[PDB]
Amino acid sequence: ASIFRCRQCGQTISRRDWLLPMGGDHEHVVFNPAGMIFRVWCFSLAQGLRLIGAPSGEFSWFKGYDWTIALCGQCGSHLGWHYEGGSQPQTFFGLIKDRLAEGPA
Template identity: 55%
Template sequence: MLQFNPDANTERDSDTRKDDELYCSNCSKLITRGRWRIERNDDHEHAVFNPAGQIFEIACFKEAPGVGVIGQPSNEFTWFKGYHWQIGFCLNCNSHLGWQYSGADIFFGLIKSKLTSRKS
């Protein structure tokens, strides 16, 4: 009798998982995965600016295990109504990667230029 093992990875599954990974562009630490993309304000990607006028292109993810957070949650100049933000950094090299947002749920707004799909 043929049995199916749900934990078994096929070669194709393995390739898909590998291609799905997003790394810190500074140190190559695994930060998040494409399958964890989410939409906020009807979009996955956003162009936003801070009070100093710096523009960021960010992408939203429901999980980012490679990101640590620092600072007290703040709702000042939040880009997502009803959410507080904290600065997010790479757990390996401490590079600023974006922000963690907390409100009705928790998600990450990560700076696109700080992520790469290639592990160096």
């Protein structure tokens, strides 16, 4: 249990080694304006994604960061968001834990 893959197609996305404790925790439970709850895991790094649109600061769960939607680059599954424009770190990924599958490298 050290690699994260897209639950829908198996695309390589991230690693347990790349977990990032933003505000002292890698897990953040958050709600969007449509009331959907997400268990978000923060990663320093991810791969195999496709970032859609231009960054937005509106409704950001992380103060000082703008977000872009992150799809699975293979199947188009919505896996979370890329954050940028902030400080320490400048960028990171917030990925939806239940849309990933954890397993061996």
